[PDB]
Amino acid sequence: YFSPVMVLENIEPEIVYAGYDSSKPDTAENLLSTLNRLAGKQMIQVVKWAKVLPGFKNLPLEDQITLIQYSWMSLLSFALSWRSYKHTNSQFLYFAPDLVFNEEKMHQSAMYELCQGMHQISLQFVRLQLTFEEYTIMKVLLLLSTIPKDGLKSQAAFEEMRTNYIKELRKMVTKSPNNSGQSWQRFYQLTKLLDSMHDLVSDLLEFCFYTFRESKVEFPAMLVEIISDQLPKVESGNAKPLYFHRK
């Protein structure tokens, strides 16, 4: 089918600024509009990254679009967890170099409990001492974690890609079991962490869909397009989360 992990390390998008205006009042509307502005800019980076992701080009365009639309919140939240871990040892939420949340901003954003949920994932990165190689493979698995209930246009091509990235994660933990002791132990800690993202992302999307439909919260064109397509699919039960270990 295929060093694909060395490709993943080299194609990871560069950090982007939020464009946070600290002279404007820190109302929830201003903070959430800033997060949406940042999410839109990051989504352009995600599409460019996915285009050069080994294997992704094999999937038909309709399936590439479906996967990006269903996984956007997972990809962005997992990368937020990574930056928080790398840059602050998971003490703060590192949205961008110019936007680092403390308790004050978590309250001001009107997303305090969701920010605490996010902080709990970054704390798991510290507990596991997650490596960049592990992070990059796991982020590809998140792009491949949510599909239509009735499947994709090219379901077998998708399954081949996801199976091969799972094999890469198993090989990575076989070469490096890290602080978990044995290779199998590491593997199940990583798959348990990947599965835990579905519940956090479901909660993040519920609030995002609420502000999108009831809105001074501004959304960039990139998010208006993704959310307008995704929202009816998620709410009608068409988005099937793939779990390694069923609840």
Binding site: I44, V47, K48, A50, K51, L61, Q64, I65, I68, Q69, A221, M222, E225, I226
Partner: peptide, 10 residues
């Protein structure tokens, strides 16, 4: 043609 379609096909 959507923004995603534009970006993925360019």
């Amino acid at each position: 043609k959507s923004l995603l379609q534009q970006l993925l096909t360019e």
